[PDB]
């Protein structure tokens, strides 16, 4: 994660992120809609930070510091590069839409009027197919990854030392190997919850209410195929 985005999403809400004099110039329904859009971007930034801890810190750390058997790191961190690519492109698009919405002379005051189009593009066509195929794979290999992690920690002493060492920072308190896998699996089921609450405060522009309804249907369609595609593998 980068300091710039960490500060832009450091506040507990959109109402606390913007200047109080900018906040006071908006209708309460706009403040409420913006609070949920901000939460969607904030949690997507956290999701991408989770995937980067998995690729750079755990996955790459194990290759460069451990003599683990080939294919064991793949079994521990399935499809993490693919997942990292998908969500980093999505975060990039949400972050640019926020920057576009910035008030000239400000780096914090913005109001996003269009979001549904970005959500429709992400959860439709080839991009939705790629997430469907990737989350179906990741979730079918989830239990085997936890079991493989547990075996390695119970039999290898150098693997124990590596884990103790990388997970020592307080910033990684809720981000151990198993926590990262459950965080990733649980991510996709957050989208309908976030999009429905955004849609609830988006009845000002009818093209937006329809766009957010198309995207809500598209995410639920995706989750149903990801759920149907799950077939748990064993160690």
């Amino acid at each position: 994660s980068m300091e710039m985005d960490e500060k832009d999403f450091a506040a507990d809400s959109w109402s606390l992120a913007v200047d109080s004099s900018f906040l006071q110039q908006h209708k309460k329904e706009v403040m409420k809609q913006q609070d949920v859009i901000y939460e969607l971007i904030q949690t997507e930034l956290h999701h991408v930070r989770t995937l980067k801890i998995m690729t750079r810190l755990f996955r790459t750390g194990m290759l460069e510091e451990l003599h683990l058997e080939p294919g064991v790191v793949q079994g521990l961190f399935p499809c993490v590069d693919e997942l990292s690519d998908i969500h980093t492109r999505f975060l990039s698009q949400l972050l640019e839409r926020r920057r576009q919405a910035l008030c000239p002379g400000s780096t914090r005051n913005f109001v996003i009027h269009r979001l549904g189009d970005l959500l429709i593009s992400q959860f439709s066509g080839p991009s939705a197919e790629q997430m469907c195929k990737t989350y179906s794979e990741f979730c079918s290999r989830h239990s085997k990854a936890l079991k493989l992690y547990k075996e390695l920690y119970a039999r290898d002493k150098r693997f124990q030392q590596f884990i103790r060492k990388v997970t020592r920072p307080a910033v990684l308190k809720r981000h151990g190997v198993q926590e990262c896998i459950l965080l990733v699996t649980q991510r996709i089921t957050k989208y309908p919850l976030l999009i429905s609450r955004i849609l609830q405060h988006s009845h000002g522009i009818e093209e937006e209410r329809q766009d957010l309804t198309t995207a809500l249907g598209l995410v639920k369609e995706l989750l149903s195929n990801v759920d149907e595609g799950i077939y748990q593998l064993e160690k």
């Binding site: 507990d12 979730c139 459950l182 649980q186 996709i188 609450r197 759920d227």
Partner: protein
């Protein structure tokens, strides 16, 4: 410091997300209540034992029967939640949630938690329930359900007022420690 895992389960609007948020949050959500909960590792000291309690939510997983069970591995205590302003969510506790929790988590202690206890004497809640020929869940109805499902215990709390929240999570830590 031992690591223990807590998972909260229950119907859509049982208040499980609000409960996790109010507990993990240093202060109370005065300005914005978040839509979702990611995870949290709490430092709890109960009866002289120092524990690291990882907290997980199943909100959003209710309709996905092959995805939801991925939340269960290595759980040490289950909070089985229902809403006191919704007697229909209590009927689903033994029919839907208990067979699932016992199949995936055999021998894991379950605490049956009645959330939103403040709505028991709320006027709009009692009027809406009377149209449905119903009333808020009585304390003895919750205890009778906890007894019938073989729960470790029964507890009530209000995430809105914070009453009973700290006691639920300390008891969950005690239940997780017992072997």
């Amino acid at each position: 410091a031992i690591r223990k895992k807590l998972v909260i389960v229950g119907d859509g609007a049982c208040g499980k997300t609000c409960l996790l948020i109010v507990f993990s949050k240093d202060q109370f959500p005065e300005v914005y209540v978040p839509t979702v909960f990611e995870n949290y590792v709490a430092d709890i000291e109960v009866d002289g034992k120092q524990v690291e309690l990882a907290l997980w939510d199943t909100a959003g997983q209710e309709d996905y029967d092959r995805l939801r069970p991925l939340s269960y591995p290595d759980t040490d205590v289950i909070l089985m939640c229902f809403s006191i302003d919704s007697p229909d969510s209590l009927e689903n506790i033994p029919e839907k949630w208990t067979p699932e929790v016992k199949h995936f988590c055999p021998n894991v202690p379950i605490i049956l938690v009645g959330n939103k206890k403040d709505l028991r004497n709320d006027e709009h809640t009692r009027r809406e329930l009377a149209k449905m020929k119903q009333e808020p869940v009585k304390p003895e109805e919750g205890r009778d359900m906890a007894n019938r499902i073989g729960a470790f215990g029964y507890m009530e709390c209000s995430a809105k007022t914070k009453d009973g929240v700290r006691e639920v999570f300390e008891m969950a830590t005690r239940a997780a420690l017992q072997a």
